[PDB]
Design a protein around this nucleic acid. Structure first.
Ligand SMILES: Cc1cc2c(cc1C)N(C[C@H](O)[C@H](O)[C@H](O)COP(=O)(O)OP(=O)(O)OC[C@H]1O[C@@H](n3cnc4c(N)ncnc43)[C@H](O)[C@@H]1O)c1[nH]c(=O)[nH]c(=O)c1N2
Length: 458
DNA sequence: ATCGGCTTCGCGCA
DNA sequence: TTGCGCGAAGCCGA
């Protein structure tokens, strides 16, 4: 009734006599959620309530108000949603290692379930959780169509090597979601959102005139809005996606990534609705490849390379190339603070940084250019990786995500890419030029949208 | 083996 | 712009 290959037993023990607890982390949604659909089932077999617990930890100080409101507002909407299904929602504030471990005792949980995320630190918590628990601990991949550990069992070198593996399992894992059965066995935020903002308030990004840089109206948060972005994409942009996706002057991207990041929407549902949309094959194929292949190879990459954010996980050829050019003369070198405020010589580069700063979502094509000029105008790879990680995670609404580390590592160190012509500083890593951007899209339109803002920020 | 074929490249040319 | 061929380049995998 649910494909069991979505579950990995983490810790074995005695199904306690009490409620099943869904430890919610990556997939912050109440529909299309295999981990909550499993949680409700084991609850159903033992006639207990299902509760959901969410742990709010101090990592919000590492990013900004922009991500932190996007999250807390969905969770306000989420809590309403679960409670309509008789599912209470418990919000802890502290480190998951002990908050989830005491909660399991304090509530005499019968069973623990969590969703899957490949990032280092969730495995730390999990492991510290396992150490302090006695009831069983289960994990469900509710983020990938094909559960990450089943799609491939090794780091995948390239997309064309992972693509055939994935598409063989798709007939079996691409399926419809059953209906979340509300509890029969019947079992603060705002204040938590207000406290945070004032912690984050002195670090807000401000214009010269004390005005917030960020514009909070390009992406409304929530399960319900995420579905309506998915609906406008299928209605208005799926047809043109294939052809206009690399023009940053036309808003022809799905715009779905901030929601997928927080798991405010299942990518499986998107694949589902896209698959049945009558539109252009070139568009549907190009898109399915982004949301299936490139999204899930970025989980693959984080999962099988624990150092997914360091120089050391680049390919051998890439490292040998970059190191041989460590001593080449850089034509410009900017500090972190200099990129951050768009104060380089390159008005195209400055514009994309203006787009990141003020919308929280930079155009996907521009993201390659942005990051490769970072490698070109910093004093070393390591610093370039540093600066590019720190700004992608400070300011992208979709930041702090495996897709992040795996695209940074594409751009700077050639992971899941190949070797190209050898040049100074950047070695054999793929090159992108301003003149290349010019023949592809009207760069002066892009730069005009944002050049107004540069001299306004401080 | 042993060879095509590789996300998102740049550029000259028509 | 717009599509095509050619380039330079390392490695997987049937
Ligand atoms: C320098 C740099 C930095 C980042 C990223 C790339 C690069 C080169 N990415 C990946 C990608 O650029 C980004 O997901 C898209 O711009 C998302 O915008 P749309 O949702 O509109 O994508 P669009 O509608 O074009 O694609 C659909 C979905 O496919 C997936 N996808 C598309 N391109 C991908 C890519 N290059 N890598 C992985 N999955 C991809 C995403 O889930 C995306 O929402 C990333 N992604 C992210 O989610 N968060 C981040 O913080 C970053 N950071």
């Amino acid at each position: 009734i649910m494909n069991p290959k979505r579950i990995r037993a983490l810790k074995s023990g005695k199904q306690g006599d009490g409620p099943v607890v869904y430890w919610m982390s990556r997939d912050q949604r109440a529909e299309d959620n295999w981990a909550l659909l499993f949680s409700r089932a084991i609850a159903k077999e033992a006639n207990v309530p299902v509760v959901v617990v969410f742990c709010l930890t101090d990592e919000f100080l590492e990013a900004g108000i922009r991500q932190y409101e996007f999250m807390l507002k969905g969770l306000q909407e989420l809590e309403v949603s679960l409670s309509r299904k008789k599912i209470p929602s418990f919000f802890l504030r502290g480190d998951p290692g002990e908050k989830i471990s005491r909660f399991v005792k304090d509530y005499n949980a019968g069973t623990l379930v969590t969703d899957f995320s490949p990032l280092r630190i969730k495995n730390q918590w999990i492991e510290k959780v396992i150490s302090g628990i006695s009831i069983p601990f289960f994990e469900v991949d509710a983020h990938n169509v094909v559960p990450c550990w089943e799609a491939s069992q090794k780091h995948e070198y390239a997309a064309h090597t992972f693509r055939p593996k994935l598409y063989a399992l798709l007939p079996e894992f691409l399926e419809e979601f059953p209906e979340l059965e509300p509890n029969s066995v019947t079992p603060t935020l705002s204040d938590v959102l207000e406290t945070g903002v004032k912690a984050l308030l002195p670090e807000r990004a401000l214009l010269k005139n004390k005005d917030p840089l960020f514009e909070p109206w390009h992406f409304e948060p929530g399960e319900k809005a995420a579905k309506k972005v998915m609906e406008s994409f299928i209605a208005d942009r799926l047809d043109s996606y294939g052809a206009l996706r690399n023009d940053p002057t036309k808003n022809m991207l799905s715009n779905l990534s901030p929601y997928l990041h927080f798991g405010q929407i299942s990518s499986q549902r998107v694949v589902l609705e896209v698959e049945k949309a009558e539109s252009n094959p070139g568009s549907k194929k190009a898109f399915l490849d982004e949301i299936l292949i490139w999204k899930e190879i970025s989980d693959n990459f984080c999962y099988y390379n624990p150092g997914y954010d360091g120089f050391e996980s680049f390919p051998s050829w890439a490292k040998e190339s970059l190191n041989a050019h460590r001593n080449d003369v850089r034509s410009h070198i900017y500090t972190l603070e200099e990129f951050e405020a768009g104060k380089t010589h390159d008005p195209l580069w400055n514009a994309s940084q203006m787009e990141l700063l003020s919308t929280g979502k930079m155009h996907g094509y521009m993201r390659m250019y942005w990051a490769k000029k970072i490698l070109e105008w910093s004093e070393s790879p390591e610093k370039a990786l540093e600066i590019a990680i720190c700004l992608n995670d400070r300011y992208e609404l979709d930041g702090r995500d495996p897709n992040g580390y795996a695209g940074i590592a594409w751009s700077i160190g050639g992971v899941h890419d190949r070797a190209w012509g050898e040049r100074e500083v950047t070695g054999k890593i793929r090159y992108m030029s301003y003149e290349g951007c010019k023949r592809k899209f009207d760069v002066k339109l892009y730069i005009e949208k944002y050049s107004a803002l540069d001299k306004l920020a401080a």
